[PDB]
Swiss-Prot record:
Disulfide bonds: none annotated. The chain holds residues 952 to 1161 of 1166 of the full protein. Zn(2+) binds at C130, H133, C138, C141. This is Poly [ADP-ribose] polymerase tankyrase-2. The gene is TNKS2. Residues 8-208 form the PARP catalytic domain. It is found in: Cytoplasm; Golgi apparatus membrane; Nucleus; Chromosome, Telomere.
Length: 208
């Protein structure tokens, strides 16, 4: 049931999504080990992901959460990186997309920093890098990220350097406590609490 609609680079919607991608790149403490060495991307394509069933599954859950949280879904737009973006856009998020070994337990992980999600595109810790060249810093191969609508509801705040949400909460927020420049990461424990809105195809760019 999924169709992908290409956005024109002239469309304000393309431009706002690209700006969120580019403006949330940061340096990582691994020196580029997992995700590569880059300060910016070459955006090749941005597609809107359209699936009625998956959208309705999302809005159903969103209303449930809103009703448990004084009519506030606490909805965010966040990045997700995974080798399984094709499964996600066709069948939705579910327990197979959970990061069993993550810092906040076995849930589905989303990032404010696009460059954090980039570290997961080829697998946990970058896996072995791109399929073709086995390079986690590949500047040739096309990568894909999802920019997703995520319902946080009442989020459990973890200060730091499928499972269930903490009791009385709908998500977990991982607040950076060491790296002053890192943005937050978020975990949900129900696939229906995220919709994969945009599929972004890109390359990382070699610094000049
Ligand atoms: N898979 C991801 O995009 C991700 C986001 C935030 C933290 N860890 C992983
Ligand atoms: Zn490559």
């Amino acid at each position: 049931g999924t169709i992908l609609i290409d956005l024109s680079p002239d469309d304000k919607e393309f431009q706002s999504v690209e700006e969120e991608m580019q403006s949330t790149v940061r340096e990582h403490r691994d020196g580029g080990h997992a995700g590569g060495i880059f300060n910016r991307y070459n955006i090749l394509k941005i597609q809107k992901v359209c699936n009625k069933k998956l959208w309705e599954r999302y809005t159903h859950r969103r209303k449930e959460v809103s009703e448990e949280n004084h009519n506030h879904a606490n909805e965010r737009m966040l990045f997700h990186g995974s080798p399984f973006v094709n499964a996600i856009i066709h069948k939705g998020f579910d327990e197979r997309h959970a990061y069993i070994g993550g810092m906040f337990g076995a849930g589905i992980y989303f990032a404010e920093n696009s460059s954090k999600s980039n570290q997961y595109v080829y697998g946990i810790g970058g896996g072995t890098g791109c399929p073709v060249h086995k390079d986690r810093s590949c500047y040739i191969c096309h990568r894909q990220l999802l920019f997703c609508r995520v319902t946080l509801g009442k989020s459990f705040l973890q200060f730091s350097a499928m499972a269930h949400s903490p009791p009385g909460h709908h998500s977990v927020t991982g607040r950076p406590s060491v790296n002053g420049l890192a943005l937050a990461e978020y975990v949900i424990y129900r696939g229906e609490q995220a919709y994969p809105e945009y599929l972004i195809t890109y390359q990382i760019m070699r610094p000049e």
